[PDB]
Amino acid sequence: AMLTFDALAETSEFARKWVPFVKKYNIEPRAPEWYFSQKIDYLKDKVHPSFVKDRRAMKREYEEFKVRINGLVAKAQ
């Protein structure tokens, strides 16, 4: 029930980075929590030269997003 104007805009700004990312590199699975948490070594079958750099940026964007959300849950009491 976290839907608030800040929660919605942040989720949308993140999904607008994650969704292209998933399509471009055919990320499996598509859920970002399960993907980064499966530390099954994730380089198999990836061939694009921008992947390593983009995956590292994206992990940082996800992690920061997850924190901003945490701070919106705690700002609803």
Q: Count CB neighbours of 27 within 10 A.
A: 18
Contact indicator for 14, 60 with CB cutoff of 8 Å: no
Q: How far apart are CA 35 and CA 42, in angstroms?
A: 9
Number of residues in the chain: 77
Sorted by sequence, the CB contacts under 8 Å of residue 14 that are 6+ apart come out as: 61, 62, 65
- 7 by Cβ neighbours in 10 Å (0-12 / 13-18 / 19+) ranks as middle
Q: How far is CA 66 from the centre of its chain?
A: 8
Resolution in Å, one decimal place: 2.4
Q: How far apart are CA 57 and CA 64, in angstroms?
A: 11
Contact indicator for 77, 7 with CB cutoff of 8 Å: no
CB-based contacts of 27-33 (< 8 A; 24+ apart in sequence): 32/62
